[PDB]
Design a protein around this ligand. Structure first.
Ligand code: ATP
Ligand code: ATP
Ligand code: ATP
Ligand code: CTP
Ligand code: CTP
Ligand code: CTP
Ligand code: CTP
Ligand code: CL
Ligand code: CL
Ligand code: CL
Ligand code: MG
Ligand code: MG
Ligand code: MG
Ligand code: MG
Ligand code: MG
Ligand code: MG
Ligand code: MG
Ligand code: MG
Lengths: 246, 62, 246, 246
C-alpha cells in the first residue's frame, strides 16, 4: 500500500475527516439536535447547569426559586429561604435573618449549540414574580437577543454561541426562560406537514440538571467529556472543531 | 425524565440523599464522585413502557 | 562465584524455590492452617467476608439475620428490617414497608484453602429459621458438597477451592454453616492422642469479618495483600502458586 | 382397586403412616438433629427465642447482658442499661435511673427435641458475672437437671422436653448455658472413630434468635409452622405426634 500521510490514497485519513464532517453537518440537518444550556453561577463557586436537547426547537424555563442554589443532602436554610423569597417577591414581605441570600445566582450564561439559528433566539428575563417587563399588561413576552451572542470558536470554527450577563446588584432577582430554533435554511417548514413531529419533540426533549462545585469541575467533568461548547470566566473557549478536520 | 428523576425516592424515609448526590457525580463522569457504594439500589433495574390501545404504534418514538 | 542463572550453584535461586515450597507444604502439614471464607454479595455491590483460620478443622455458622448487609456508621432501616425478618420467618408475619430487602445476599461464595481435604467439606444451608431441610425431624444436619467445588488455579497449581451459588429468587432466604477438615493423609488421627489439642483449636481459631464496598476493593485490599485465593464474577482466579516455584 | 379405608391394600394410607414414622425415627437416629431452645420471657409480654440445631450434641450459652430484652430499631435506654448492668454485677456499682430493668427476663423455658437423651442434659445457671455457684473455686461447672424436665405430649407421644423456671425476684439475675446429647442407645461412641465429625458438628450447628411480641405470636408464627414442641403459660402442649400415625 501507499505510505501514510504522503498520497491521495490515505483512506484512513479521508475517512477520519469525513467522520468528523458528517457529525458537524448531521447536527445541522433537520434530523439533528439543537441544544441549550443555562448556567447559574453562585458565590460559593458552584454552578447549576440546566441543559435541554431536542429536535427542531428547544428551551428552558425556570422560576426565581428554581434557579436558587440547592445543595443536595446538605442544609439549605430552608425555612429562612422561604422568608427570603417572600421579601424578594414584595419588598419587606418576609422576615428573613439575612440581607442577601448566597443562593441567588451571581450571573447567568446561556449557551446554544452551533445548530441553532441565532436570529431565532428569544429570552424572557422576568422579575422575581415571573413578569417579563414590570406589569403583564405592557410586557412583550420575550426579547430577541441573538445580536448579543458571542461565537464560541475553536480552530476558527463556531462551536456554539454564548450570551452572558452578571447579576451583581441586590436588585438582580430574576426568573428566566430562553428558546431557540434549529437552523432551517430550506423552505420546508418543520411545523407544516411535520407539525405533529414537532409536537412529539416537545415530549422527546431530554433534560439534565446538576450542581457542580466549581467552574473547573464543570469544564473537566461536564463540558469536555461530552464535546460541549463553553466560555469560562477568563474568556477561554472550549469545544471541538469538526468540519473538514481530522 | 432525567436520570436523577427515575431514581427511587422513598417519600418520608431516608434516601442516603448526600451519598446519592455523590453517586450521580460518578454516574455522570467516571470517578467523578466520592460515594460510599459501588451500585445505587435507587437505579432502575428495568423499564416498561405501555401505551393505550388508542395509540398508533408506528408513531411511537423513544 | 558462579554467574546467576547459569549453574547448579545459584544458591540464592535454590533457597528462593525452597522457601516457597516450604510454605506450600507447611500449610499442608498437620501443623498448618486450614481456612474458610464465606462471601455474601449484596445488590449495592458490597461484599461481607467472614473468614476463620484454624488448625485441624475449621468452619463458619451464621444466622439469616447475621448475613444481611449492615453498614457500619450509616442508617440501615433498622426498624423496618426487624419487620422484614418477621415476614421472612413466616409469610405475612411482619409489617415492613418493602417487598425485597436489599440487605439480603444475592449470592454466596465459599472458599477453602488448598490445605482442606475436599471430601470432608460439609454445608448446612438452612432456611431462614435455621432448619436444614424443611422440618428438623427429616433433616440431615449437612450435605457433603465437595464434588461441587471448583479448583482455583494459578500457573497450574491448586491455590484454593470454590463453591458459588446465587440467591437470585425472592424465596432464596438462608441461614448457613460450612465446615472442612485439614488434609490428613496419615493414619495418625488428630482426634486421638491429640484430641485435647483439637479442643483447644476450637478456642484458638481466629475470625475476621468486614464489609468491603466492591469486588474490586475486596480483590485489591483483602484477597491480594494476604495471598488468599479467590474467583471473581468474570471467572478469573487469584492466588499465588508456590510449590517448586520461584 | 380396593375402596379407601376398608382393606390392607390402602397403600396411600400405609405410605402416609410410614412417612410420619420415618420422620420420627430418623430424628432419633445418629444421622438426625438434636435441638434446644431457650425462651426468655419479658414483662412487656415479648419473648426472646434462641434455638440451636445440630447433630450429636447441642447447646446455647449466653451472658446476663445478652439475655436482656433488646428491641431492634427502637430506643432501649442504652446508656441507663449500661449503668443497670454495673449495679447488677456488683451491688451499688452503677448510677442507673431505675430500680428494676424491665429488660431482665421474668422466666426461662428450656426445651429440647424428643431426640435428646434427658439423662445427658446439663445446665450452667450462673450469677450475673458468669460464675455457676458463688465463686469459681467451689463451682461445679453444671448441674444435671434432666429429672426436672417435663414431657411435652401430644396424642400420647413425647414431642419434646421442658424445664421452666421463673425469675420473679429482684435477685434473680442470671447467665445461662445449657447442653444435651442426642440419643445413642448403641455402643458406637460418636466421639470415637467419628470424633472429627463431632468437631465439624460444632461448626455446622445452625443458630436462630429473634424477639417475638407475645406468646400468641410465638405459638402461631414460630412453634407451629416449624412443628416444634412447646408448653404455654396455661400448661397447654403443642407439637405433632408422628410415630405410627397418619
Ligand atoms: N500560525 C498559523 N498560521 C496560519 N494559520 C494558522 C496558524 N495557527 C493556526 N492556524 C489556522 O488558522 C485558523 C484559525 O485557528 P485559531 O487557532 O486562530 O482559531 P481559534 O482556536 O478559534 O482562536 P484562538 O486560537 O485565537 O483562540 C485554523 O484554520 C487554524 O488551523
Ligand atoms: N506457552 C506455554 N507452554 C508450555 N507451558 C506453559 C506455557 N505458559 C505457561 N506454561 C506452564 O504451564 C503450566 C500451567 O500454567 P497456566 O498459566 O496455563 O495455568 P493457570 O494460570 O492455572 O491457568 P490459566 O493461565 O489458563 O488461567 C505451568 O507450569 C506454567 O508454567
Ligand atoms: N376417648 C378415647 N378413648 C381411648 N383412647 C383415646 C381417646 N381419645 C384419645 N385416645 C388415644 O389415647 C392416646 C392418648 O391421647 P391423648 O389425646 O389423651 O394424649 P395427649 O394429647 O398427649 O394428652 P391430653 O389430650 O390429655 O393433653 C392416643 O393413642 C389417642 O389416640
Ligand atoms: N427567618 C428564619 C429562619 C430560620 N428559622 C428557624 O430556625 C430553624 C432552622 O432554620 P432552617 O432555615 O430550616 O435551616 P436548617 O434547618 O439549618 O437547613 P434545612 O432546613 O435546609 O435542613 C427553623 O426550623 C426555624 O425554626 C426561623 O424562625 N426564621
Ligand atoms: N459520600 C457520602 C455519604 C454520606 N455522608 C455523610 O453522612 C450523613 C448522612 O448521609 P446522607 O447520605 O444524607 O443519608 P441520610 O441522612 O441517612 O438520608 P437522607 O439525607 O436521605 O434523610 C451526611 O450528612 C453526610 O455527612 C458523606 O459524607 N459522604
Ligand atoms: N415498618 C416500618 C419501618 C420504619 N418505621 C418508622 O420510621 C422510623 C425510621 O425507620 P428505621 O427503620 O429505624 O430507619 P432509620 O432510622 O432510617 O435507620 P437506622 O434506624 O438503621 O439508623 C422508625 O423509628 C419507625 O418509627 C416503621 O414504623 N415501620
Ligand atoms: N443513668 C442514666 C441514663 C441516661 N442518661 C442520659 O440520657 C440520654 C438518653 O438515655 P439513653 O439511656 O441513651 O436512652 P435512649 O437515648 O432513650 O435510648 P437508646 O440510647 O437505646 O436509643 C443519654 O444520652 C444520657 O445522656 C444518663 O445520664 N444516665
Ligand atoms: Cl435535513
Ligand atoms: Cl505433620
Ligand atoms: Cl444411626
Ligand atoms: Mg441526610
Ligand atoms: Mg430546617
Ligand atoms: Mg486556536
Ligand atoms: Mg496462567
Ligand atoms: Mg478417642
Ligand atoms: Mg431508626
Ligand atoms: Mg441514647
Ligand atoms: Mg390429646
Amino acid at each position: 500500500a501507499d505510505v501514510a500521510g504522503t498520497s491521495n490514497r490515505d483512506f484512513r485519513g479521508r475517512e477520519q475527516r469525513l467522520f468528523n464532517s458528517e457529525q458537524y453537518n448531521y447536527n445541522n440537518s433537520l434530523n439533528g439536535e439543537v441544544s441549550v444550556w443555562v448556567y447559574a453561577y453562585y458565590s460559593d463557586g458552584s454552578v447549576l447547569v440546566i441543559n435541554k436537547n431536542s429536535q427542531y426547537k428547544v428551551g428552558i424555563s425556570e422560576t426565581f426559586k428554581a434557579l436558587k442554589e440547592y445543595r443536595e443532602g446538605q442544609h439549605n436554610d430552608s425555612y429562612d429561604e422561604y422568608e427570603v423569597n417572600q421579601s424578594i417577591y414584595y419588598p419587606n414581605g418576609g422576615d428573613a435573618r439575612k440581607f442577601h441570600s448566597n443562593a441567588k445566582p451571581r450571573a447567568i450564561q446561556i449557551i446554544f449549540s452551533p445548530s441553532v439559528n441565532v436570529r431565532t433566539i428569544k429570552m424572557a428575563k422576568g422579575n422575581a414574580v415571573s413578569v417579563p417587563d414590570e406589569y403583564l399588561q405592557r410586557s412583550h413576552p420575550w426579547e430577541a437577543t441573538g445580536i448579543k451572542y458571542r461565537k464560541i470558536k475553536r480552530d476558527g470554527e463556531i462551536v456554539g454561541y454564548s450570551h452572558y450577563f452578571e447579576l451583581p446588584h441586590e436588585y438582580n432577582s430574576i426568573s428566566l426562560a430562553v428558546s431557540g430554533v434549529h437552523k432551517n435554511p430550506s423552505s420546508y417548514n418543520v411545523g407544516g406537514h411535520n407539525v405533529m413531529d414537532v409536537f412529539q419533540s416537545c415530549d422527546l426533549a431530554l433534560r439534565f440538571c446538576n450542581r457542580y462545585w466549581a467552574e473547573l469541575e464543570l469544564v473537566n467533568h461536564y463540558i469536555s467529556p461530552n464535546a460541549y461548547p463553553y466560555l469560562d470566566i477568563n474568556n477561554h473557549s472550549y469545544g471541538v472543531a469538526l468540519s473538514n478536520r481530522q
